[PDB]
């Protein structure tokens, strides 16, 4: 169980919240 | 169980919150 | 159980909060 | 149980808070 | 049980707070 | 039980606070 | 005379190219 | 005369190229 | 005359190339 | 005449290349 | 005439290449 | 004429290559 809370303002950069069970490339 | 709370403002850099069960490349 | 709290402002550098159960490359 | 609190401002360098149960490369 | 508190400003260098249960390479 | 408090400013060098239960390479 | 050439791909962080003749805040 | 060429890929951190004739705060 | 060439990949930290003729704060 | 070439990969720390003709604070 | 070439990988610490004609504080 | 070549890997400490024509404080 994963819980993500993201409160943001004036955001230019990328914000990434994720769960990668297996293989992933960014 | 993973809990992530991210409070941010005036953000330029990338903020990454994640869980990698297996293999991952950034 | 892992708990992450990140309060930030005026951030240029990358901020990474994560749990790597197995193999991971950054 | 791991608890991470990161309060930062004017940050250029990378800030990494993480738990590596097994093998990890940075 | 590990508790990490990092208060920083004007940071250029990398700040790493982590727990390595097993093998890890930086 | 390990407690880490790091108060820093104008930091260029890497600051590392960590607990290595087993094998670790830096 | 200022010349800026920015070739980028897969960009998450903010890329800023600018000329500040006088006072500026980021 | 200032010339800036920035070729980048897979960029997370902020990349700043700029000329500050007078006073500037980052 | 200042010439800047920056070739980068997999960049998390801030990369700053700049010319400060007068007073500047980072 | 100043020439800067910066080739980098897997960079967390801040990399600064600059020319300060007069007064500067970091 | 100053020439700077910086080839780096896996960098956490700040790398600074600069020319200070007059007064400078780091 | 000053030439600087810095090849580094796995660097935590600050590496500074610079030319100070006049007064400088670190």
From Swiss-Prot, chains A, B, C, D, E, F, G, H, I, J, K, L:
Modified residues (Tyrosine amide): 26
Source organism, top-level taxon: Eukaryota
Subcellular location: Secreted
Effect of residue 4 to A/D/S: Promotes formation of fibrillar aggregates
PTMs per UniProt: Amyloid fibrils are degraded by insulin-degrading enzyme IDE.
Misc. comment: IAPP is the peptide subunit of amyloid found in pancreatic islets of type 2 diabetic patients and in insulinomas.
Domain comment as written in the entry: The mature protein is largely unstructured in the absence of a cognate ligand, and has a strong tendency to form fibrillar aggregates. Homodimerization may be the first step of amyloid formation.
Subunit annotation: Can form homodimers. Interacts with IDE and INS. Interaction with INS inhibits homodimerization and fibril formation.
Function summary: Amylin/IAPP is a glucoregulatory peptide hormone that plays an important role in the regulation of energy homeostasis. Selectively inhibits insulin-stimulated glucose utilization and glycogen deposition in muscle, while not affecting adipocyte glucose metabolism. IAPP function is mediated by the CALCR-RAMPs (AMYRs) receptor complexes. Amylin can also bind CALCR receptor in the absence of RAMPs, although it is more selective for AMYRs.
Family stated for the protein in its record: Belongs to the calcitonin family.
Name by which UniProt lists this protein: Islet amyloid polypeptide
Species per Swiss-Prot/TrEMBL record: Homo sapiens
Organism lineage string: Eukaryota, Metazoa, Chordata, Craniata, Vertebrata
Full-length numbering of the shown residues: 45 to 70 of 89
């Amino acid at each position: 169980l994963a819980n993500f809370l993201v409160h943001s303002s004036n955001n230019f950069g990328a914000i990434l919240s994720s769960t990668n069970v297996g293989s992933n490339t960014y």
